[PDB]
Design a protein around this ligand. Structure first.
Ligand code: HEM
Ligand code: HEM
Lengths: 145, 145
């Protein structure tokens, strides 16, 4: 259940999420596109879900991909900002879950984002400790799908 | 067409947008809900588009409405952050427009948000000057619908 998953966000997990986001969230356009390009490269099977974006291999040059990527980073920003209040984190998570549920994105499918996050984190000197913290946040979303 | 609308965003308009956002965007939950509840109060017909939110009369206490309202404010945060780069502003606005186009929301219907914005701004003491600046930002979105 999403309510139980949200309870997994302990003090130190929230702290690691904030400290890493301070760096990653500094460049939403660059890191956003990096996150999406890595997902498509590591999991080509997911490209089909993004037909609306057009040629995803163009990266930054693709306006729709860039617009999508920047927006994705504001969803993460939203989550980080709601860490203080579990009640608000949950309602924002379920809200965001609806859009993915509508596109028939399962919890297992959503979980594929963990790889790309771990890689982007690593490129900024944030190791496993941080990747695992982010995995916990992603898990909250998975519980709502 | 969206680029042309974005041209109306002059240096003075962008300055008023940023200054007012510094206050309005500081309480996303509070002001986001105030915006939505004012829209419903002044234009009851718009409630027809929000059946998914349920009992919108509960206001802040309604989790779905609260979740939706906080998220709406991050859309504005996104727009405000992209003001200095027309290319990025445009791709984000177009991305956002897709969701409202799919829900058959016309430019005229979308423009009904201008009244609520003016009232929320006035509640924080930002006069007509600021309301006019925000109406121009809204116009960029309308150009995409
Ligand atoms: C960190 C995790 C993720 C975040 C925060 C995220 C965020 C978002 C946001 C904010 C949108 C745009 C608003 C909307 O249309 O609902 C979106 C759209 C979408 N997401 Fe995700 N997402 C994530 C992971 C995934 C994954 C792993 C998949 C599936 C492989 C997925 C599939 C989709 C699809 C298909 C769209 C529609 C794109 C379009 O046609 O414009 N998302 N996502
Ligand atoms: C400043 C103006 C506005 C902003 C920033 C805004 C923002 C948003 C965002 C971010 C979403 C959720 C993500 C998505 O699914 O696309 C959304 C959904 C929606 N918006 Fe807007 N919106 C605005 C004005 C309006 C107006 C005036 C209407 C029309 C009466 C409208 C109708 C809708 C509808 C029907 C949904 C889906 C709600 C749901 O089922 O949860 N929006 N809007």
């Amino acid at each position: 259940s999403v309510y139980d998953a949200a309870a997994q966000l302990t003090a130190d997990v929230k702290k690691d999420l904030r400290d890493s986001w301070k760096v990653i969230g500094s460049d939403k356009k660059g890191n956003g596109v990096a996150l999406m390009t890595t997902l498509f490269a590591d999991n080509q099977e997911t490209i089909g879900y993004f037909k609306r974006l057009g040629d995803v291999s163009q990266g930054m040059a693709n306006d729709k991909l860039r617009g999508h990527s920047i927006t994705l980073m504001y969803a993460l920003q939203n989550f980080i900002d709601q860490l203080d209040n579990p009640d608000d984190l949950v309602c924002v998570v379920e809200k965001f879950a609806v859009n993915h549920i509508t596109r028939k994105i399962s919890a297992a499918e959503f979980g594929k984002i963990n790889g790309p996050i771990k890689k982007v984190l690593a490129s900024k000197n944030f190791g496993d400790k941080y990747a695992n913290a982010w995995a916990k946040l992603v898990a909250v979303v998975q519980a709502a799908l």
